[PDB]
Amino acid sequence: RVKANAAKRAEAKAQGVAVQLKRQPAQPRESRIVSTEGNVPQTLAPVPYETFI
């Protein structure tokens, strides 16, 4: 991470102004559109009890 941060800082100071060198925790997911083309929702129901012994 230190090596990559040095490289990223060098490229930043050679290109422009942006660093974002600190790690970040996993973020909440962004919005997404889920398609049903070939993926029409399949309805499930809880199963009745049985023994299968």
Binding site: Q24, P25, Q27, P28, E30, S31, I33, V34, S35, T36
Partner: protein, 222 residues
């Protein structure tokens, strides 16, 4: 040889300029919120028209209220509540949602009620019970000058700038949220809505994630 009038006039002029800046920024915030809300609604409608499902972005902000007293708390949840600044029952704080803080909310679930605060909830919370931590002292946010004097270095000039930095989890959310003293809420005015507070909200209790009903609860407690 008075050195008073030409300074009071200068101060009034500077105050007018700062007020004009705040007014323009608040108008921009109103436009931002309206556009984002209508865009989310239209995105849902468009996905439905296209036969898809618009999965909204996961919530970036939670409001957490400690609903349990201070006695008989195991040490790990006790430390987590301290680190979230919930050291009194009905004390509430804003938490930015990451994995690092979701694993804290998980640990303190049986002692807190938390959810996703709306703009109205945040606005009323800050307006009525907004206190800043200034010189380790709890100072009511009765004037935009207090907010500018303590958060102006982060670009937050007014109470509405503070609210914007809270609701949109901005680059300086950590600083603004920490400047906000933990909110000291009352008990809910219409009660808790359940006979027993200390089972999960899903199980008919009060604690855990009550995601959007946190607004009703906090508005009753505020």
């Amino acid at each position: 040889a008075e050195q008073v009038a030409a300074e009071r006039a200068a101060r009034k002029a500077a105050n007018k300029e700062k007020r004009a800046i705040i007014l323009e920024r608040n108008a921009a915030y109103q436009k931002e919120y309206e556009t984002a809300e209508r865009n989310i609604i239209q995105a849902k409608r468009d996905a439905k028209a296209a036969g898809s499902y618009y999965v909204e972005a996961q919530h970036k902000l939670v409001f957490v209220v400690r609903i349990k007293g201070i006695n008989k708390i195991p040490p790990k949840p006790r430390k987590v509540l301290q680190l979230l600044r919930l050291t009194r029952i009905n004390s509430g704080t804003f938490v930015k949602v990451t994995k690092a803080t979701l694993e804290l909310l998980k640990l303190i679930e049986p002692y807190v009620a938390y959810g996703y605060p709306s703009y109205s909830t945040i606005r009323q919370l800050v307006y009525k019970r907004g206190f800043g931590k200034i010189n380790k002292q709890r100072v009511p946010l009765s004037d935009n000058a207090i907010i500018e004097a303590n958060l102006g270095k982060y670009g937050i000039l007014s109470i509405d700038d503070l609210i914007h930095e809270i609701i949109t989890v901005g680059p300086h959310f950590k600083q603004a949220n920490n400047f906000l003293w933990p909110f000291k809420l009352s008990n809910p005015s219409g009660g808790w809505g359940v006979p027993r507070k200390f089972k999960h909200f899903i199980q008919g209790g009060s604690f855990g994630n009550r995601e959007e009903f946190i607004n009703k609860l906090v508005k009753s407690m505020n």
